[PDB]
Amino acid sequence: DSLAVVLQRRDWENPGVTQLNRLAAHPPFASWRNSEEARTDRPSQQLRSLNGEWRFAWFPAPEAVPESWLECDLPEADTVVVPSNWQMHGYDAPIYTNVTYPITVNPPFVPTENPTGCYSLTFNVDESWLQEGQTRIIFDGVNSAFHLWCNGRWVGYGQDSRLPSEFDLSAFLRAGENRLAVMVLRWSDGSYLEDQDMWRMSGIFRDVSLLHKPTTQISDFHVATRFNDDFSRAVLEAEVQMCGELRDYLRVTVSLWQGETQVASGTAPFGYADRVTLRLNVENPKLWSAEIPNLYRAVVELHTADGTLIEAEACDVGFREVRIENGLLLLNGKPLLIRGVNRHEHHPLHGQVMDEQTMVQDILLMKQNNFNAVRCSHYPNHPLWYTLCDRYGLYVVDEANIETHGMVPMNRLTDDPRWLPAMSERVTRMVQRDRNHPSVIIWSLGNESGHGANHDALYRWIKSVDPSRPVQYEGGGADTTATDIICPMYARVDEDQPFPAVPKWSIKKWLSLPGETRPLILCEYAHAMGNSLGGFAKYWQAFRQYPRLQGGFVWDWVDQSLIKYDGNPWSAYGGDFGDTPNDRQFCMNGLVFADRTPHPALTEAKHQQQFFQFRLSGQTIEVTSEYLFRHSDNELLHWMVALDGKPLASGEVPLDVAPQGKQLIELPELPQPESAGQLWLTVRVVQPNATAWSEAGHISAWQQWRLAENLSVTLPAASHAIPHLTTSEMDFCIELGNKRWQFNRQSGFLSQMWIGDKKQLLTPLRDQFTRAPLDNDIGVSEIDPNAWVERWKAAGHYQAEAALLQCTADTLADAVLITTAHAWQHQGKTLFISRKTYRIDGSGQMAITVDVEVASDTPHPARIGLNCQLAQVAERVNWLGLGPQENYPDRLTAACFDRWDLPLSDMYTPYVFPSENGLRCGTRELNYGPHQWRGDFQFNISRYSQQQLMETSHRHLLHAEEGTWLNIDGFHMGIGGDDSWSPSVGRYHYQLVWCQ
Amino acid sequence: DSLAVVLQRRDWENPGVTQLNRLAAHPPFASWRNSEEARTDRPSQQLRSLNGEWRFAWFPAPEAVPESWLECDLPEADTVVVPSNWQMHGYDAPIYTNVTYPITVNPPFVPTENPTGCYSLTFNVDESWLQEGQTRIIFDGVNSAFHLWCNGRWVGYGQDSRLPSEFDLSAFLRAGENRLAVMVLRWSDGSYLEDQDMWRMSGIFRDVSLLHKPTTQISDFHVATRFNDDFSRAVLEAEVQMCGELRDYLRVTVSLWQGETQVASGTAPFGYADRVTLRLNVENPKLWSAEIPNLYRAVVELHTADGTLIEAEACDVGFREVRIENGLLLLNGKPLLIRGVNRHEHHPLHGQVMDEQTMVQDILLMKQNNFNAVRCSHYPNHPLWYTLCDRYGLYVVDEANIETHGMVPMNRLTDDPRWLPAMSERVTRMVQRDRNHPSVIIWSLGNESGHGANHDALYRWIKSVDPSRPVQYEGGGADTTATDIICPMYARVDEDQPFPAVPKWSIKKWLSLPGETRPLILCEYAHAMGNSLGGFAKYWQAFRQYPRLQGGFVWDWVDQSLIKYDGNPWSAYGGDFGDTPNDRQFCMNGLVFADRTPHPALTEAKHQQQFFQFRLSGQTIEVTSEYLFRHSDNELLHWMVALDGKPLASGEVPLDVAPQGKQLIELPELPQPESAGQLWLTVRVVQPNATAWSEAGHISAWQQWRLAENLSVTLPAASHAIPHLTTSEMDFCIELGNKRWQFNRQSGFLSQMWIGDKKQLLTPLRDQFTRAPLDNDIGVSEIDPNAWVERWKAAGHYQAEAALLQCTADTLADAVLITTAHAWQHQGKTLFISRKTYRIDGSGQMAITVDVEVASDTPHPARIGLNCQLAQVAERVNWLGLGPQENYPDRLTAACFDRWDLPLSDMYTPYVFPSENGLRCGTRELNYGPHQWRGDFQFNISRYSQQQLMETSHRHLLHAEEGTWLNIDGFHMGIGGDDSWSPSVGRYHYQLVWCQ
């Protein structure tokens, strides 16, 4: 039992040993001794949880642990809660890595400096559990490899952190009063297959439980389902196995309860002598789908011949079919549209400890935004997660914990047949544990782990064990024989990326490959890096057009940010804990923050994933529902008519459309005003009744159209004022009453403007050709020549110097005309030339026409527009245009044209990495304090300059600059968003009107 | 390093641990430091064999071993040779079992009384091997699981007896002078998968070697082949891997030598950074097939940039293609005819220790009888066996060591995913070790081990790793998705055997199954239990008729008999060593004896497996060759004409027939004698030139036809003698000169006959309806109601009592007429009635006509004929009929009609289990001493009575009875031979003539 004996074998450095005296995997059990408690999911006294206060000690190496541990708790041992992680309690700094292994690349050898978490607990046991029966401990998760000592006696050894590990303890437990000793290692052989793009982190991060069973017990049972052609008639296969002594009087009963009412049942004795097959016929079953989570509570009973109950076990069972034919993924006889998401397991204040409140809230947020698919990335999740998924309705794509991305080459390990034991354990235990749940539809053998022979073997094993689920696997080009569902990573829509032996075809070309008939779902796509989720529409357009393209999984859901205290909490990324090597802000790809505050990208995803598409044909509206089984019985359309912001007419039409059907909505006689402007038709689908995952009045979909537009009519500029512009050598001074504008003659820019006495411009009006660093532009630079920001720096756009010219004009009949031009040159090469024209009439309205030309050889300029720093600091920003949330030219789909007003705080989004943000495009009229600008432009308003945004790496380091910064841009490129390691995105003119 | 520490883990009782610090599998290597030595297969000094005299101690349990072992040899330790087995040296009795596990059925637990072989050796090492390089030990086989201690230091643990186990010893070896300690266990977890129908036996049964390699070495290399349509152009893929430090100056060279001449070559540096691909084009390659073993010696060199050689490795490579299309197994573009055999590894004086002399002699005997296929049953064989197979030409079907027949149900283990590690090891190590050899054509995953999911996984892994070979597997009805070559066991030709979930269709029905397109080869068929190999022809007729039926494997080759000393050696079976439970004589199924003396069944197999089929059309002869690639350039037909034994005309015609072609041989004007009798045409194909496996004048095929028959003409019976039969109350006495015959009137049988004075009959002439117990009749009885011998016993045929009747007639004009009848009744029910008629003419010729009727309700009588014990004991037996070897009605195909003369010793075959044998059918004339019998009958002559044959279980217990026993039978049933556990086989009259 001594450490000097146990650790000498170095079992953590041997790929051929994955478990020692570990019991067989099985679906989670509670050992109910009463059928009613089993059916109603009441807590079972046989399952005693052991979460509480334990004793922990840290050591830099396993050998550094003294032998005084196993007899009594160390004096320096602290009191920690379990489940929890010692990495967050400051004992060592967690490290985040993307590709490079945090440890030395030498399998199966692991670094000698192996941190050891010395967890222990002293506890009592009832003699009732000891005189009879079997008592076993269940570790729902221990990262990453651990040994076990019970009362100073060695019990076994374990691995496979992300899956439950159980051992038999009835033979080391006695006299209640007892001590459990668990030693855990940060590093082991499995870490080579545990190279998730996640925080390298350890401890006991899942619940520790104590289960007591009688000598004779139910061992395993698989509940499958088959259907007829019309799904009216179906039969349930509750195959059941047991263990122990076999008595002829033993009987089993499988009872199917639709709620409190029993529908079907059956009984049979044993006879495999430990396995018995029961088939239960069900009529008109309430099918299961993401829209309707119909649940059947099937109870399996191990009961005596006279009828006394020994042990009862139950599992929620749903009736659904998932199969592949003709290249389409059919769910209950209907094609699927996977609007997925990669939910990483992460908690802002507990690391990878997950609890029911967070899980439920995540499911609620995910269902509120039309997400009906989840891929646990990249490991099986908490056991209750799947139960909640069945209860709410959410297709899950389970993913075996296999990841060896950093190994060179990728499949150096998954082709060596010495790792078949470990890979088979990590796959088969997941399959056996999570087969019964109906939500899990697609088993995935891993994310790009390289296509060897072990993946073929495991794919065939899965297809032999559970043939009711397609098996996807992305590695080896995602088109090998080890994959039923072609799942490439970041395959762009039209652009082709032909890499050697792992090419990224355009998705349509991948569909049109010769001899290819399997359906395509995107393993990962639409990186949500802050203000990103770009091309989503393009992506959703392709998904809706092409039948055999069945959606993807937006990566990723929750932001993997750990709370750091300066005492003000500030979100941090890799490298802020002193960890090296790290991967900076690449760990920040969440649709919501760690504390579940919705990102701006969430709204765009929700809009693009709506179930209702709308077509406008004159007066009528065509409404089409993407639901396949459910009727729109909880929806109510709200159409409204607005002329340049002001509403004119509105109405409500309840929706009654069949699944995959169409409904034509005839609008009333819409108003046809003679006033100048653009009429807009906004339709909003609202769910008046609160559902299990939504509140009353929930918005499900909305869309807008442009109605008849009346060309602007009257707009007479100036009244009667010939302005005697003060011509001076240093500036041109123009005064109209209390208003004054100063134009510097040495720089050629608007220096200062006056409203009476108070100054208005803290920074002269200049053109801006640059935007702050963008994740996509950066790509994998820190230098990447093809990175967009690197190309801009090489072209010197950030360091281009404006050279003033002339063309200065003079006054007219009722106004003063200023005409100027500038030349921006970097090391002598003229990058851009723009010619401006400034026009201040007798009414004070200033019209500025700028015509910009760009050299072809230089890379495309980031933005075309004017920048300045206003002296006015107002509390709100008002505009008429697309909003209210921020938008971009490539991500303006979710933006809605209306008169929006937001506080200045809302004008900047709290991205942790500062960059260009707060942009509002399609703004025909802007209001901020006393000034107002009209036309057709895009702008952002914030208290931080672009220079500060570029320089500052963290949001919490940002400081509010004096005044307000404005960047009114005529044009701007898209932000891309296809990928974050490569680019994903000549003569122009804009007209602006300045008024007050 | 102490036992009390090492054995405490009980690694032999853990299915999850199959190796500890065991190096990777690889093709056998010699580490040649010189290219010429590598090419010419000269012995390599780097490979130091360690076979010699070791030190061994036996213990009943591993714990019983004192700790004084690991420091010095025990005083009671004996000096044994290695490789050899301690079971044969009398330390414990080996046990043979068929189905029931010799140990208790409780996996993975094994009995506490675990025998331990304490093998050890003290040896010296050159410092030249120690100052540099890597020195590893290779155990070619250790049954069944063993630990290893080097110089008192623990090195690792091993399993997988039938495959080589190697460990790194450079880190425990130093100062030459050293001691190797190996502890071996008879029982371990793998014994549950090691349930071969063989002698449960242990030790170190294969060679122990010592290999030294430099720090940088060649690790693995797979040599595949592909061809064009016409096989004229082919390319060689000598993919090669290495290990250690990688230097840019390192180079590899693959050179192809057709003997002493180099044909193709190539070189390339590394770059996987440790793997390099070479492709060598070959023109007009000398293809490989069982007929022509063309060999290419490909040498792989690890050489420096300047050219100095570091390490060179070579492997014989043959050019052949094996693939499945349209339901036919194509070898080099041609269909195959598998005339296989199940060669069990067994040696009469060394157990399972196998050596080159025995292996070569077995290959010689196997090729001399048209066996061109071998299935190592059921485990990979000795590494040199495959080399010899490539060198001589013999398709091999490798079989992974998986067998769990006795487990209830069969696939209780091969579906539990906890045994996937062990099964994957036992399959993948075999595949990796034996992939390069060209003789191995079909990988087999086991014999009926039950079809779970592990077999599907391993089949897909094999098809992913080596797609050039079809994979057969017999379990689960032999038609699952885990099998490419449908291989059922003992599927009869026309009779159908519909068992639940494992039925045995008739082979033609199995061919005609719906949706079935895979070819069928018989996994096991034609049990060769002594005088058996029945239905062979039927089987070969079906094989030749049906294209998609491609032959089988005659089970089995060598008799698994161990030598027992009474000091006279006598062959023994299971249960003669005191072992219990056993399976008696079921271990005796060899085409040759243990010392390779040919059984009589060998001749019948050779005749039925001939490559040349003959058709007779008047005078010409049609000769068709079953060869597909080779021309019959070493054959010479010998046709002969014989009239009732005496030759009349003969000639020789050299054979020149294309593969799968036809040749018509025009005979000369054959004689047409007017003498009465049947003309016979016997053609024999003789190989005048000695081949690599045969001697000059080897007989390859022979066949016979019946020519024009001239009805017997003159045969006047009697001369002039009216015999005054002495009518007495107790007997009828008939005297003709010196000859006298006595007919008892109370029994109705010929009591005694006189030649002058000397008596002739020691036992009165009586009818025999019984034959001794037959393996097939016995089936699985010891009581089986359907067993034929049991049915005969129930009917009382063995205990039927002859009741005398009358009809006694009197003399005629020139002779005396006796007419009698008898009734054989068992408990009052008349089983048979026969009426005899005895006719002694004036010439002394006695004609006996017997007419026999049989009750329908009783089972068919074993034989119809006369039995007696002659007083004459002659040294030879002469007859004109089918021979010279023994034959049976169902196995008379190999028998040839001719005047044969054999010594009385040859008249009885030395089957270890005595039974009915020595039978010669189709005997038109018999000669033995002074007497002679003519007609058309079947007979056997021996010194042992049928009663003694039934009673005596061993041949060596047989004692020569006085006189000679004769059983002249008119009719006899077949012996069957389809299987040995179930049956596999009304009014009659015969005429016999007795003369002198």
From Swiss-Prot, chains A, B:
GO terms for biological process: lactose catabolic process. Its cofactor is Mg(2+); Mn(2+); Na(+). Changing residue 782 to D/Q: Small increase of the catalytic efficiency, when the sodium concentration increases. One of its GO terms (molecular function) is alkali metal ion binding. The record marks 981 as: Important for ensuring that an appropriate proportion of lactose is converted to allolactose. Keywords: Glycosidase, Hydrolase, Magnesium, Manganese, Metal-binding, Sodium. It holds the Pfam family Glyco_hydro_2_C. The record marks 344, 378 as: Transition state stabilizer. Gene3D superfamilies: 2.70.98.10, Galactose-binding domain-like, Glycosidases, Immunoglobulins. This is Beta-galactosidase.
